[PDB]
Design a protein around this ligand. Structure first.
Ligand SMILES: Nc1ncnc2c1ncn2[C@@H]1O[C@H](COP(=O)(O)OP(=O)(O)NP(=O)(O)O)[C@@H](O)[C@H]1O
Ligand SMILES: Nc1ncnc2c1ncn2[C@@H]1O[C@H](COP(=O)(O)OP(=O)(O)NP(=O)(O)O)[C@@H](O)[C@H]1O
Ligand SMILES: [Mg+2]
Ligand SMILES: [Mg+2]
Ligand SMILES: [Zn+2]
Lengths: 598, 620, 227
DNA sequence: CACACACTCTCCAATTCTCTAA
DNA sequence: TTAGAGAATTGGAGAGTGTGTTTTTTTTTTTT
């Protein structure tokens, strides 16, 4: 048993008296400071830590963890009773006028309190949240599958009577409630006045509300099982912390959903459950001098996938893909090869390095396609758009394996992306436009066997030229025997299996975070071409077109491609004007990509 | 009123301190392990009290509440505070139940209110949801707390309580629910189906619904072969003021056993006594099938597998081994698949024309316990950390093989259906069997035209074997001799002119009662099937590691194979040697090391693995 | 609709031919004053396995007499002139071999599969129509009238429950008997492919709609086709 | 089932009938 | 003669009772 009044007094004592020596030994009363802020309305949410509560009463922490909703109410009541001690927009105006009438505690309450969970509690998986943990504070990890828009949830409804000019209040707890109709005040009832109640949305307390669904991490599920899911209901300042696809740990109260009416007799003693979220947590000039070393271009190209030898100019092209040209701007590239040629490994490296990216197969996936898809979620039945590799990759790069094996719907979708960088999709017969400006990194196979150079690329790869010409660079990752390189590759693979790590390579790859910083500040530079370099572009382009005509996949898009690549290298040099080396690099990269194809 | 006598009998049975101490020791183990159901053997109950055992098995509900109350009294006497820490202590029954051992077919209506042990295969499971048994409420207007127990037709006492909580009035004051002080129990429903081989003639397999509560909910998933001990009961489906006599029936389970899942010292001695035990195991793999030695070695490698790497960069290297058998009619491909289905744990059968991309991966289905729709696992998800056998693989549709591509490539399958977007684990070895195009293999056509599959798909298999009905007279002599010997065989526990009986239930205890070479023949000391099962079950776990000499030899011989491809005939090469072939070499060497239980991949393992790769790549 | 009670349950299976004695009555839970009707069964008579001792004596005498093979061959399709070796093959098909389970658990089929290719107007279809009648379990199908699902097994959504359920095709309906596939050459190739597992392994492995099982198809395939 | 239609049934009291005083 | 107090008759307000509540497989025709 418990004496909850004494518990409230002990909670008041903790809030008044706790200090933690923050800001390097200033002996701050942290909860007193936050109480001052709440009283002044400069702060709305108060995340009390049960690790702090443990430092003077472990029994109180146990009582909170075992009966969390009760103690949430007790902590809130204690804080509200203590705000005047530390009291040195529209609802504020209404509370002022109601104080004038005095001259509904839940309405006058304009703060919220949450328990930041204790570190002694291990963070569970969703599957480990047993029925014994109902009504108890639990910490749960998972992927955020889906999040609803923030909606207003009525906490305390406020009505006004037409006949007697009196306000009436209706606190709300259940997910459904009966709105009041006829006036209950005695001056209406005794006079039989027939006065009725009008809801005042202006003078009634709402709260931000958001419904999301967590899901098990795939590598923690048992072997033969579907991943489990849990509905998480989020209120107040906890809203908008999460996004779909994010990894989170949620401290909250595991509770049952108490439905009304016909569902009660149908379900019987069983009940659905939700997690009442209390806390959601989410799982350089020396370096610029290193960048300043003029090796940096080749240093980065070496840092790109030391697991793959050779193809260094392809690595340079991939670097320029991540950099992008002047804003168009995406350096789409394609690299064909046989199966197993290390082509997939290279694409996997770009997907891992890039800050925003996706990796998928052109074929036929049972997942969400390259375009987004509309899920149903039939417990609610509300259809919602989700995913899409191109959409998830929007600001970055989308990697497609076996691009040749795409369906015609996928080919038309990529064609639309190449044209205008947006796609069309239907939710419920109606349709919208959905945005995707990702660069495409395409890997494709020969239609049959190992590539034969005697056959042209479109006839061999079996892709339409309308798509295949979109890519700025076309590379052929051909594989043939070579004794010493095969032995080096084998030694690398065997060391990887033997030690689970790449062997030393007689150099140090740059940190991927530092590479990301570098390409970010690089992408923030905005080059422009001068007229002399435009003339140089003209001369180089016409000579290259002579070579292509004498050996035809060269057009105005070729001039635009070399301009894009030269501006990309100008970004790489981190200078706001292009130079002869940029055009030379673009010309040789295109030429030697054709040579690789030849 | 009369159940105090039964409670006295069960308390006397539990107090084993006087004579043997078995069940006082088990209750002590329950207390120490912090569990709250006791596993009782009805054979011991027979030995001490035959009358009470018969009453328990024939009057199950009243006898079980008596037994549970006796258990609560006993655990209170041993440790009172621990007895308060749980609402009630259950009892799960094991042992031999006599005629009550049934299947879902033979579980007729005459078994109602009896303890029955049902053996079958799990087809589906509902999601775990909590169920209220006692709710605690508090009155702020009175500073008083009250409680309400809850029961329904599923509970042993079986009274239906009102579903709703006390709400706005007690003492005509508003109550509110103390969820933390309330107690809830897990609830799950599964469906146990008859074993498919044991159905009579054209009858389809029947099924029975089972209800799991509290700690039983985790102990069964679809595809599991289980024995469930429980009480059989009917649930009246009243409309309210009227009912048809038709009542659905359920089995409230008190105990679940995984009958197919499951000492090592004798294995670790046998690996020393035997010389190159991999060869002996491979020869003894499928005794009924003659020849195909290298294929049997490859299948043993598939069964044992490599070790799956997780790299420091977060990428993973798939450890499973995939085998594709291509060959003529009547060269035992289907029979090798059937042997793997019988010998391996969690091996899923599949045939190309009888399966779909949905059924291979996952299907959206409505859970009738609630009406909400959820994913129901397909073949390759059921086969996770197991094997999937695909016969007539060349007869699949391309859209169906799109599903197989992701499973083989990444060990997962991505799904986006209903409300769920998920990457399901499908980490399984694929053993596929196919005929070449035109039915029979054509010597006058290249292998890439005999093999109708796409090169992209073929790259995903570790080993590809071409096996041909070459009509050599000596090979035919030995094959026909073996076949006729097999057809002449009759079992010792069978009369001289018997036709074998069609299937019927023959398991009559919850645990197997009769608890390494074949005795008939002299040549090479063939290993028995049961010992092979146990040895593979042990040897899969060893996880050996590469050595410098084996790594060097694998790299050197891989370089030789690659450089040999420079002048090898393009018109007749089985499959191009690549880094994928090197991964195959590493996995096969690791599997051989697992077979030896060596803990180090040695030069012997490398030699045998690369010999197998040489045979598979450059021999018909 | 029939209602079987107590010991009448499982006294008959699908595909059997019966005479039903019962009470024609209304179910008693488009139009208004309508009630669905059914027969409350109180007697089942299989019109055509528990033999009498007299019948067993007759069968033992038949097995004992020396020319039983020729007697059976003459008894098969007595209206069909000639074709005596084909009738003998049909006798071997009807009696079938012995199923065997070997020590490693692999099973060998005892059923005999018999194809009759040849010229038209040669009593092949009539021999199939005799075997359907004569076999203890017998199912007659036209190849052109068949489908892969309909031969082996079909997966369909139960209308009253929304679950996917299994339905036995001809090869499941004929389990423990004979399948007579007439005009066998008229099937499409993808449908002839479906019966490969059931002809040899005598099983129908299914992985569709989340239900995954291995039905039994222990049956003999008798097929007829033209050139 | 707990929250709405439709019907019955009960007693309160709203309005008129009758006798009396202004 | 006209208007207010006591008694009689009937309207209806309110309480109680009864009832009502996308996603997979298989086929068929036609589009290429
Ligand atoms: N080497 C062998 N030893 C023993 N039995 C064999 C052998 N080869 C074939 N058989 C028998 O031949 C029959 C057919 O075997 P099966 O596994 O179906 O061959 P298959 O290679 O799969 N041909 P198919 O199914 O037409 O592609 C079985 O009864 C086998 O036991
Ligand atoms: N030897 C025979 N004895 C008796 N009737 C016969 C004989 N041969 C053919 N018939 C008759 O010919 C008719 C056609 O026989 P049928 O069973 O269709 O032979 P079929 O070869 O299967 N025809 P088809 O489907 O074109 O190949 C029937 O009425 C048979 O009884
Ligand atoms: Mg076969
Ligand atoms: Mg015919
Ligand atoms: Zn009012």
């Amino acid at each position: 048993l418990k004496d909850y009044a004494l518990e409230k007094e002990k909670v008041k004592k903790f809030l008044q008296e706790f200090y933690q020596d923050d800001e390097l030994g200033k002996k701050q009363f942290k909860y007193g400071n936050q109480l001052v802020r709440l009283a002044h309305r400069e702060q709305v949410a108060l995340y009390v830590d049960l690790d702090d509560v443990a430092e003077d009463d472990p029994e109180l922490v146990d009582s909170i963890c075992e009966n969390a909703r009760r103690y949430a109410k007790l902590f809130a009541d204690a804080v509200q009773e203590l705000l005047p001690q530390y009291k040195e927009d529209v609802l504020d105006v209404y509370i002022e006028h109601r104080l004038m009438m005095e001259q509904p505690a839940e309405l006058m309450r304009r703060f919220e309190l949450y328990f930041q969970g204790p570190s002694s509690n291990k963070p569970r998986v969703i599957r480990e949240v047993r029925a014994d943990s109902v009504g108890k504070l639990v910490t749960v990890r998972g992927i955020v599958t889906r999040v609803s828009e923030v909606k207003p949830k009525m906490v305390v409804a406020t009505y006004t009577c037409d006949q007697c000019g009196a306000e009436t209040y209706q606190p709300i707890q259940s997910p459904t409630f009966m709105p009041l109709i006829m006036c209950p005040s005695q001056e209406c009832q005794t006079n039989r006045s027939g006065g009725r109640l009008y809801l005042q949305t202006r003078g009634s307390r709402f709260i931000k509300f958001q419904e999301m669904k967590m899901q098990e991490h795939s590598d923690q599920v048992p072997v033969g099982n579907i991943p489990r899911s849990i509905t998480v209901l989020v209120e107040g300042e906890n809203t908008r912390i999460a996004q779909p696809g994010d990894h989170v740990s949620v401290t909250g109260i595991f509770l049952p959903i108490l439905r009304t009416g016909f569902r009660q007799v149908v379900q019987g003693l069983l009940s659905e459950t939700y997690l009442e979220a209390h806390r959601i947590v989410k799982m350089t000039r020396e370096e610029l001098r290193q960048i300043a070393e003029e090796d940096f271009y080749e240093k980065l190209a070496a840092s790109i996938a030391p697991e793959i030898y050779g193809h260094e100019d392809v690595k340079k092209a991939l670097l320029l893909l991540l950099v992008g040209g002047v804003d168009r701007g995406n350096i789409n590239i394609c690299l064909m090869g046989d199966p197993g040629v290390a082509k997939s490994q290279l694409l996997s490296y770009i997907d891992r390095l890039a800050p925003r990216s996706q990796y998928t197969t052109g074929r036929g996936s049972s997942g969400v396609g390259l375009t987004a898809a509309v899920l149903r979620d039939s417990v609610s039945g509300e259809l919602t758009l989700e995913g899409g590799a191109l959409v998830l990759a929007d600001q970055g790069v989308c990697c497609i394996d076996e691009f040749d094996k795409m369906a015609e719907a996928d080919r038309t979708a990529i064609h639309e992306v190449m044209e205008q960088q947006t796609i069309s999709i239907a939710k419920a017969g109606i349709l919208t436009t959905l945005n995707a400006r990702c660069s495409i990194l395409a890997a494709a196979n020969p239609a049959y066997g190992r590539y034969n150079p005697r056959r042209s690329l479109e006839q061999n790869i079996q892709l339409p030229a309308a798509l295949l010409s979109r890519f700025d660079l076309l590379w052929l990752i051909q594989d043939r025997p070579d004794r010493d390189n095969d032995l080096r590759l084998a030694q690398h693979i065997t060391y990887v299996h033997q030690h689970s790590r790449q062997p030393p390579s007689q150099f140090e790859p740059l940190d991927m975070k530092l590479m990301r910083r570098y390409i970010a500040m690089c992408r923030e530079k905005q080059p422009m071409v001068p007229e002399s370099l435009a003339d140089y572009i003209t001369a180089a382009y016409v000579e290259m077109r002579r070579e292509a005509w004498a050996s035809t996949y060269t057009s105005a898009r070729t001039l635009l491609a070399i301009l894009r690549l030269s501006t990309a290298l100008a970004r790489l040099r981190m200078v706001d004007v292009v130079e002869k080396e940029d055009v030379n690099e673009a010309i040789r990269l295109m030429e030697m990509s054709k040579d690789s194809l030849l | 009123v009369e159940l105090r006598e039964a409670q006295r009998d069960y308390l006397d049975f539990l107090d084993d301190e006087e004579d043997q101490g078995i069940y006082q020791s088990k209750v002590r183990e329950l207390i120490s392990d912090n569990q709250y159901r006791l596993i009782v053997n009805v054979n011991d109950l027979r030995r001490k009290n035959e009358k009470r055992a018969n009453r328990l098995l024939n009057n199950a509900f009243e006898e079980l509440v008596a037994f549970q109350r006796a258990l609560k009294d006993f655990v209170a006497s041993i440790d009172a505070t621990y007895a308060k820490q749980y609402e009630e202590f259950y009892v799960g029954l094991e042992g031999s139940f006599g005629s009550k051992h049934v299947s879902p077919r033979t579980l007729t209506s005459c078994f109602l209110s009896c303890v029955v042990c049902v053996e079958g295969i799990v087809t589906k499971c509902s999601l775990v949801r909590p169920k209220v048994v006692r709710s605690v409420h508090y009155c702020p207007a009175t500073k008083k707390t009250i409680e309400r127990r809850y029961s329904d037709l599923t509970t042993l006492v079986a009274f239906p309580s009102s579903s709703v909580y006390p709400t706005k009035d007690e003492e005509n004051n508003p109550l509110e629910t103390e969820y933390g002080l309330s107690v809830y129990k897990d609830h799950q429903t599964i469906t146990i189906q008859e074993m498919p081989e044991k159905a009579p003639a054209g009858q389809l397999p029947r099924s029975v619904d089972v209800i799991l509560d509290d700690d039983l909910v985790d102990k069964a998933k679809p595809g599991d072969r289980v024995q469930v001990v429980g009480t059989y009961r009917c649930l009246p489906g009243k409309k309210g003021g009227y009912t048809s006599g038709t009542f659905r029936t359920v089995l409230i389970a008190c105990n679940v056993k995984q009958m197919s899942k499951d000492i090592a010292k004798i294995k670790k001695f046998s690996k020393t006594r035997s010389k190159d035990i991999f060869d002996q195991l491979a020869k003894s793999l499928a005794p009924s099938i003659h020849g195909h030695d290298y294929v049997k070695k490859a299948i043993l490698c598939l069964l044992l597998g490599g070790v799956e790497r997780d790299l420091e960069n977060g990428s993973h290297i798939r450890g499973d081994i995939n085998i594709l058998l291509i060959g003529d009619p009547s060269v035992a491909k289907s029979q090798l698949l059937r042997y793997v289905l019988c010998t391996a744990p969690r091996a899923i059968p599949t045939t190309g024309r009888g399966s779909s991309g949905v059924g291979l991966t996952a299907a959206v289905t409505t859970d009738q316990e609630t009406g909400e729709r959820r994913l129901e696992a397909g073949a390759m998800v059921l086969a996770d950390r197991g094997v999937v056998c695909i016969d007539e693989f060349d007869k699949m549709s391309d859209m169906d093989r799109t599903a197989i591509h992701e499973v083989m490539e990444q060990g997962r399958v991505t799904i986006a259906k209903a409300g769920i977007h998920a990457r399901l684990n499908a980490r399984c070895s694929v053993l596929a069997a196919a005929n070449p195009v035109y039915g029979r293999y054509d010597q006058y056509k290249t292998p890439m035209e005999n093999i109708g599959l796409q090169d992209s798909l073929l790259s995903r298999f570790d080993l590809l074997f071409i096996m041909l009905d070459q009509m050599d007279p000596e090979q035919d002599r030995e094959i026909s001799d073996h076949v006729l010997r097999m057809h002449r065989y009759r079992a010792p526990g069978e009369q001289d002119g018997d036709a074998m009986p069609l299937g019927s239930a023959v398991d009559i205890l919850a645990t197997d009662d009769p608890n390494l070479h074949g005795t008939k023949k002299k040549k090479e000391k063939m290993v028995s099937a049961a010992f092979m099962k146990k040895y593979i079950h042990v040897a899969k776990i060893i996880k050996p590691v590469l050595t410098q000499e084996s790594a060097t030899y694998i790299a050197e011989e891989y370089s030789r194979l690659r450089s040999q491809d420079s002048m090898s005939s393009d018109t007749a090469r089985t499959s191009p040697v690549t880094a994928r072939t090197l991964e195959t070499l590493i996995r096969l060497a690791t599997a051989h090391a697992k077979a030896r239980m060596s803990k180090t991949v040695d030069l012997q393992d490398a030699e045998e693995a690369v010999e197998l790769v040489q045979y598979a790549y450059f021999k018909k | 609709q029939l209602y079987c009670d107590r010991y009448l349950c499982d006294k008959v299976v699908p595909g059997n031919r019966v005479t039903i004695m019962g009470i024609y009555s209304i179910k008693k839970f488009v139009g208004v004053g309508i009630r669905s009707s059914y027969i409350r069964v109180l007697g089942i008579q299989v019109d055509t396995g528990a033999v009498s001792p007299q019948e067993e004596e007759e069968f033992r005498r038949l097995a004992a007499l020396p020319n039983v093979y020729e007697v059976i061959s003459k008894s098969i399709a007595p209206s069909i002139f000639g074709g005596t070796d084909m009738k003998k093959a049909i006798a071997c098909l009807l009696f079938g071999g012995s199923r065997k389970r070997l020590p490693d658990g692999l099973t060998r089929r005892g059923d005999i599969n018999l194809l009759m290719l040849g010229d038209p107007g040669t009593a092949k279809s009539q021999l199939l129509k005799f075997v359907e009648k004569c076999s203890p379990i017998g199912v007659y199908t036209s190849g052109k009238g068949s489908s892969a699902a309909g031969l082996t097994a079909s997966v369909m959504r139960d209308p009253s429950s929304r679950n996917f359920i299994m339905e036995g095709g001809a090869m499941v309906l004929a389990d423990g008997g004979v399948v007579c596939i007439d005009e066998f050459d008229k099937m499409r190739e993808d449908d002839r492919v479906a019966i490969h597992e059931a002809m040899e392994q005598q099983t129908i492995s299914i992985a569709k709609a989340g239900i995954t099982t291995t039905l039994n198809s222990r049956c003999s395939v008798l097929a007829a086709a033209n050139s």
